[PDB]
Amino acid sequence: APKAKIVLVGSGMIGGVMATLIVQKNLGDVVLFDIVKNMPHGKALDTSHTNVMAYSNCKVSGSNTYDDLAGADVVIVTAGFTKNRDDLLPLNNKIMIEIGGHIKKNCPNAFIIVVTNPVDVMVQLLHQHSGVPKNKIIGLGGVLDTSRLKYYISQKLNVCPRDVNAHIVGAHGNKMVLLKRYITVGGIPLQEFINNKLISDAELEAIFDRTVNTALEIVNLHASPYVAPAAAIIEMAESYLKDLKKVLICSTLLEGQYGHSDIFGGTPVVLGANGVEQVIELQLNSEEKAKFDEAIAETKRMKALAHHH
Amino acid sequence: APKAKIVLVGSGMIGGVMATLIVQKNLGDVVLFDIVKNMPHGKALDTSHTNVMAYSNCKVSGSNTYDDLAGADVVIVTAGFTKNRDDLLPLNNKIMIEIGGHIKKNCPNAFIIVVTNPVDVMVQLLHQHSGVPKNKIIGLGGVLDTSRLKYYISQKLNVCPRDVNAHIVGAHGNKMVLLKRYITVGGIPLQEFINNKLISDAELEAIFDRTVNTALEIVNLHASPYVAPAAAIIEMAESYLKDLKKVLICSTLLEGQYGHSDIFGGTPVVLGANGVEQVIELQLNSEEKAKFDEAIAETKRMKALAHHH
Amino acid sequence: APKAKIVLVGSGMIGGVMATLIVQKNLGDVVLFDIVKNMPHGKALDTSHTNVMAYSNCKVSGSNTYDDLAGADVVIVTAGFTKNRDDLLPLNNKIMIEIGGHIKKNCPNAFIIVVTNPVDVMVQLLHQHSGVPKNKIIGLGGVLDTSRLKYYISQKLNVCPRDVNAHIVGAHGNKMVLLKRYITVGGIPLQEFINNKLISDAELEAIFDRTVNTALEIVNLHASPYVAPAAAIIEMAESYLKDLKKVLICSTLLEGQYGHSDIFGGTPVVLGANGVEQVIELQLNSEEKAKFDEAIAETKRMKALAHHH
Amino acid sequence: APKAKIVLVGSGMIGGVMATLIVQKNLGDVVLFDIVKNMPHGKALDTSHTNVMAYSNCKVSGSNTYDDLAGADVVIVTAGFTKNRDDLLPLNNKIMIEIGGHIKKNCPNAFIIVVTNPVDVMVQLLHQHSGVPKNKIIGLGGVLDTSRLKYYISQKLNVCPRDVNAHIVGAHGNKMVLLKRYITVGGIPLQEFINNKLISDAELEAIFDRTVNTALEIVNLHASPYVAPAAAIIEMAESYLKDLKKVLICSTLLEGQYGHSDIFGGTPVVLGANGVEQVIELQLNSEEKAKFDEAIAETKRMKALAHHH
Numbered sequence A, B, C, D: 001a002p003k004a005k006i007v008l009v010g011s012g013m014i015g016g017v018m019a020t021l022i023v024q025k026n027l028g029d030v031v032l033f034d035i036v037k038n039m040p041h042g043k044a045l046d047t048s049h050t051n052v053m054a055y056s057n058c059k060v061s062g063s064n065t066y067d068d069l070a071g072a073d074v075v076i077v078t079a080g081f082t083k084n085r086d087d088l089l090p091l092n093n094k095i096m097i098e099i100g101g102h103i104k105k106n107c108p109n110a111f112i113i114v115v116t117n118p119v120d121v122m123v124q125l126l127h128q129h130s131g132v133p134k135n136k137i138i139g140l141g142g143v144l145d146t147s148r149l150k151y152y153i154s155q156k157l158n159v160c161p162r163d164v165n166a167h168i169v170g171a172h173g174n175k176m177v178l179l180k181r182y183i184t185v186g187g188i189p190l191q192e193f194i195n196n197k198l199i200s201d202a203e204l205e206a207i208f209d210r211t212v213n214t215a216l217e218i219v220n221l222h223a224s225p226y227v228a229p230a231a232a233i234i235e236m237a238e239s240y241l242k243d244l245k246k247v248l249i250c251s252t253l254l255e256g257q258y259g260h261s262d263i264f265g266g267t268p269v270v271l272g273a274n275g276v277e278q279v280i281e282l283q284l285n286s287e288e289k290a291k292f293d294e295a296i297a298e299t300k301r302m303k304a305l306a307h308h309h
């Protein structure tokens, strides 16, 4: 069938939520790939039954074989060690190299979404080893980080969460750049709401800090924050598959935007049938650019540690 | 059942699309009311069958009896003469009076959406004769007019239509106030896109004029523009019914916003379970306010003609 | 884009509902084609704005040019005279011939759904003149006629309409074959509900007659029954486009099923990415077959009148 | 707000998928309750962010306080020990007693769905201690077990999974009664497909055995089968909340159906705004009844072990 084939390279906790959401949305056939024996087949089996409840017809199959990447339209990479964090960098580089080789051989035309931490480094490593065009590979970041910021502001203002829009750029992770100037509520500048004393600057500062620290907050509450990451990835994948042309903030190859080249960073892009159809460069002021620069420097620092043991 | 009961007072072309969309969305039971004998029952019958295709369970029934307003949770008023246009004003005032009397008697707790042209006048007339609280009655305008502006800009910029946000205020109709300053694309100020020569000021001026004249453009093409009006109304009704708290631009009672009282005008409001939960006042500059004032003056001019023959 | 292109050949009342539903469901780009100047462009314009309300990105464009069939993935034919009814048969044959020639030239790989009355005749005429494979062209019938039967029974039994399943075969129109034996409720034989005195044989007979006469009932109520037809067609088109492999009763070329060849008739088929993937032959008894035979005879009678003036 | 409040009593793996699906479907506000400190708040936080991606507005909050059951419209009970299995029976009885006391005090009008193994026993225990009417409490079973049977047959026959309908009754668990006679495909008796050699009796026997053993199969593949259970529960909860009146097989109080009283067993019921609106008794033959009797006997055997230590 001409249904899309979506291969999840990595079938951990985020993988299972992604599979669930693909079936809910009838987005395409799913392969849960993982190096762990049996487990992806078990999760695939469980998930496949939900086709009945969902009125969908998506195959869900497990795989321990890289060659099942053949014919993939979308590949989502979450595989990688997670337990210095910097020590994992050369190990995960090797994983990106291996995965990239298989993409080059089996599905060179696939659209690739990378998630493996640190994403802004790992996406570029996979880009270089997979050989795919710059418009066909992106990293998770801004959709996820802004979902937090948007959500927290929406609860304060008592409006629909999607009606808050916001931009976090540069990198996923602790050096993410939260741009106060680019927040809107129902399309209205947030500053109007500050002027009206519906929300204060001090509240926003606390919300900014909460946003940066959210993954840590959930971990400290004895949960693992994989559900929102899954939903953000599926929003990205869906925009590609359905040619929605949504503006979504993702990690993409910079070719001079923000004064930066030869590196991936978080910025609004337009995702449609041709992949990254547009890279949007926010017209940052010097103070915002300085923070963007710090985010890029940290990506570069980690990229340098990733190459050798 | 505690399913919502949605009464469409007026079962013309817009009524049938509204009924169709309510069933698609399984939003509640529908009554198609109209003074015309038989026709609403026929349209109700046809529409009811789509429950099967939609996996829905919404009753659709016709009515020639006002007392079927009893128990309505939402009432959508499209009834009124349409063929000077000013001569119809006293006739339609009488229709609002009659409908308001029946709302007061049969469904005083209902949330009311008025559509009858000119909406910013007719909504206030129905408010006064129905006796409903100011937070429980609104008029169509801004959702519809901005759908045009958003759509036209989205096709120019090749982005998802919903990713363009915009504000048109004051009134529905030819004095609508298009606010260039409040347009965004993926939450980014439109001016950044003008700066980048992705869209020009001259293109936007042509798009503004096209927006104002769109209903006329479609009429001149030998069609009747009732589909987008239907969808805009259902977006409003849905936000109420599901407590979405969307920011949607609607006609609402002004109590000093923009310097205006004792009149309805178009402005962003938040629609949820308590009706109009918030009236948002845009911080307009003097030039924008002047245009808002012209829109209000025209509503007042027509309101004055509506009372007597 | 690899979005599907869906061409509606005929932009009358059913066309506008079809366009509306395609945008609601984000199913693909739409062309409203019609020989009438301007009107399809006006309806396309109106419908296009609903992308905003629907969170969709489907182009809707009008057309007065047959060559805009180029690249069509799905073609829905509703064009044809409607006002003896038999006198229209040779006129509509000419319309099918013209449309078939354009399909052969411009979109030979398209999946075709015919609606033009009488559908079981017109579908075969278009099949023969378009040259498309037998698995790539079907006619509306059973989805629409059974939606009525399913709906009426569901209201009697107070169950979800989709939970009633039923089969009407042979032909669309007054010789449709309603099969009492093949009705189920939640997958349970209807006879169990008759045994339990939840519904009587006499009620079902009245419901059968109502089903056959439903289009006439709605016309006699001074409405035009185009909404359910639109929804049935879109359910068919969607099953194809999304490779759902739904079992849906449609008019298809019979190659010996029910003892009949060289004619189209209503029967359950499976619709997916390869079009008509399976033709399901119900194991009818002799009494049911006799009624099927009458339906085929009437199609053949009209087919014979269609060729010459 | 009059949004529904849905309390998940138990915030384990199934709880998190349930929360995810409620937000996807915008079904209501969610409370993740659990005796484990902090964890439900962490999962609630993560899940809440998906409102942005989903265009929803459902609150998701954690709770370690039983009194947060107050105002619940739906309560889903998954809490209970899981690691003889019979030894857990008196422990889980105590958990049902505690939970029932809190339901009686805080939300006596709530609709209750029980999941705790063994469900057909635990549902009755909670019924007796909560005091809720028999139409307001059900147990998971048939929706889940039939999703497997439907799915496996649909893959064999290459049809849409929802187009296969089937009945498994008596009890959830190893004594479940699979009824070959009540399987249909597109509403057609499965026997027609056996007659046609599209599927064999021997294949169906293997599929029956696979269905009974599916949870064990997934466990043996080193996964945990909680995703399909979550989706089945949400289909049940949704039918109630939206008054869909779906026919869904659930555990319910038998008052003479199948010759059985004073016990809960799996049977088709209709779920709508009044809860269990209809209990449907399949007209089983003596051989099917004998298997139903074995399922009831096993529920009774375990119910007897549950009371005392």
Ligand SMILES: O=C(O)c1ccc2cc(C(=O)O)ccc2c1
Residues within 6 Å of the ligand: A012, A013, A014, A015, A115, A140, A144, A172, A215, A224, A225, A226, A229
């Ligand atoms: O599968 C998991 O266990 C898992 C857990 C947490 C995650 C967080 C992020 C993130 O914050 O970028 C991305 C992916 C994740 C995957």
Ligand SMILES: O=C(O)c1ccc2cc(C(=O)O)ccc2c1
Residues within 6 Å of the ligand: B012, B013, B014, B015, B115, B140, B144, B172, B215, B224, B225, B226, B229
């Ligand atoms: O039912 C109809 O025939 C009809 C036609 C056009 C309309 C336009 C508007 C609008 O532009 O506000 C609102 C309602 C309408 C209703």
Ligand SMILES: O=C(O)c1ccc2cc(C(=O)O)ccc2c1
Residues within 6 Å of the ligand: C012, C013, C014, C015, C115, C140, C144, C172, C215, C224, C225, C226, C229
């Ligand atoms: O566009 C219209 O005006 C129109 C009206 C009625 C219809 C009925 C059927 C049907 O019953 O097969 C099919 C198509 C129709 C189209």
Ligand SMILES: O=C(O)c1ccc2cc(C(=O)O)ccc2c1
Residues within 6 Å of the ligand: D012, D013, D014, D015, D115, D140, D144, D172, D215, D224, D225, D226, D229
């Ligand atoms: O939360 C979990 O870990 C969990 C795992 C398996 C389950 C199986 C069933 C089932 O087969 O009835 C019901 C609930 C479950 C919950």
